[PDB]
Design a protein around this ligand. Structure first.
Ligand SMILES: [Ca+2]
Ligand SMILES: [Ca+2]
Lengths: 132, 132
């Protein structure tokens, strides 16, 4: 009802790990989400971070809707403000100015967190949309 | 519904070749797109390149939303990642560090491709916005 078939409800949003799209670049992942009236996940709280990572496979890395528009100048795909105080970077991350796109992946005996990687590397992804 | 009147739907985006001016500089072309709540086209895929060039006149050159922020440091006008491996430059392009803006045009017996040119030269343009 509140979410389309196969999507998962949390708060005011619906979430999906696409399959049909085995693996794809950040840009291609964002267009795939956008074609379903969604966008790569925008994470504004611990609760969102935990919900999103709860529906993922710990053996896979997933693009989120966060990327570097300039020099460590992070933006969300829905234009909502980047709050450095409410982030989930793995220790040592973000690591490199060469890596402008952000994945969420699981570090054994630590848990889930964000990693800057190359935007051209193919990863899984997670889409988010307002509920119906 | 999804696109304003006379705009053309492809994937998550609406596209328009504007007619207000017969030609304009890159800045004046981007300004015109912004006045419609749009941007000069941001071409992430073969599918987008094919769709956009399908709605153009093979006798005209069109500004796209790609510009050089430094020395071949190509940036899309929506600041989304530039991927050298998914580009449509004509053979021998880009050609000059003094050419900071990008047009798409048709080479006889070759097809559509991108060319770096002076930002001050007047060309046609193509705009895109997100669908509803
Ligand atoms: Ca990294
Ligand atoms: Ca040139």
């Amino acid at each position: 009802s509140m979410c389309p078939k196969d999507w998962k409800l949390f708060g005011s949003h619906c979430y999906l790990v696409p399959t049909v799209f085995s693996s794809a670049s950040w840009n291609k992942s964002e267009e795939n989400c956008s074609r379903m009236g969604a966008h790569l996940v925008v994470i504004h709280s611990q609760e969102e971070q935990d919900f999103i990572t709860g529906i993922l496979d710990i053996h896979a890395a997933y693009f989120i809707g966060l990327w570097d528009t300039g020099h460590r100048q992070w933006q969300w795909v829905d234009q909502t403000p980047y709050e450095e105080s409410v982030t989930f970077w793995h220790n040592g991350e973000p690591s490199s100015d060469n890596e402008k796109c952000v994945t969420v992946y699981y570090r054994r005996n630590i848990g889930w967190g964000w990693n800057d990687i190359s935007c051209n590397l193919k990863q899984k992804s997670v889409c988010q949309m307002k509920k119906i």
